[PDB]
């Protein structure tokens with residue numbers, strides 16, 4: 001799994017066209033959303049993660065939170081992102097890992113937001129541009 | 144090399160403090176920058192690229208130019224971004240290839256923009272959300 005953590009003044013999106021045959025069904029409220037003083041996490045679930053989803057989700061949860069501490073971010077937004085990896089994971093496994101992380105983040109006490117999986121979204125992001133405001137992580141299962 | 148192409152409504156940046164002992168020397172102008180209706184290219188120059196510098200820059204120029212024609216982009220913005228790869232290139236080689244890309248992209252006639260190299264920058268971007276607004280390319284030499 002490949003993560004891109006960007007501490008933003010805000011993140012905002014809008015669901016345009018579908019990018020898959022069967023994207024995550026969403027209710028009206030999810031068609032768009034906005035989060036402020038947030039740590040944005042663009043995540044590319046990779047094929048190797050299909051071996052051990054739990055270890056990879058739990059591992060990513062601990063690494064996202066750690067950084068949410070460092071930058072004193074109270075809100076974390078999970079952004080399903082397909083362009084951080086070449087070897088992407090099967091759509092079904094991606095959604096699953098992303099939910100695991102989303103949920104596991106919610107139970108850590110963070111206000112968590114999320115962009116709907118499987119769609120093309122337009123979006124605005126404002127990176128704070130500080131020393132630790134931009135990080136990248138790799139979370140892969142152990143053999 | 145790794146490239147993240149965001150066809151955005153706009154791209155804005157603002158220089159903070161040096162993220163390197165020896166960053167690209169800039170003038171009062173280079174401190175802030177705004178560009179609209181542009182294809183933002185977040186480029187991570189990799190170690191592998193050190194090998195053949197002129198080769199990489201060429202395929203890169205070509206790939207970005209082609210994507211710009213598809214999306215009818217007239218303005219291209221090259222953004223030095225060191226988070227799309229774990230095997231980054233030495234700061235001197237990374238900076239050269241970036242300038243070859245910047246330069247050879249202007250030769251094509253595009254209106255090109257650039258974010259100073261070696262600085263922590265706060266930035267704002269607005270992805271369009273079209274099928275071709277978010278793209279990724281892995282351009283690597285063949286020794």
Ligand SMILES: Nc1ncnc2c1ncn2[C@@H]1O[C@H](COS(=O)(=O)NC(=O)[C@@H](N)CO)[C@@H](O)[C@H]1O
Pocket residue numbers: 019020043044045046080081082088089090091094116117118119
């Ligand atoms: N492995 C993944 N990790 C994160 N998101 C994914 C993943 N696979 C699919 N998605 C979701 O589905 C969207 C499109 O996925 S995609 O793999 O890029 N789709 C394709 O390559 C082709 N359908 C052409 O668009 C991603 O932007 C994301 O919203």
Ligand SMILES: Nc1ncnc2c1ncn2[C@@H]1O[C@H](COS(=O)(=O)NC(=O)[C@@H](N)CO)[C@@H](O)[C@H]1O
Pocket residue numbers: 162163186187188189223224225231232233234237259260261262
């Ligand atoms: N390989 C690279 N590709 C693109 N930009 C780079 C690269 N190396 C350095 N830079 C430029 O210099 C900035 C900092 O680079 S860096 O790789 O993160 N530096 C380091 O890892 C250590 N020197 C500590 O700062 C990047 O944000 C970018 O502006």
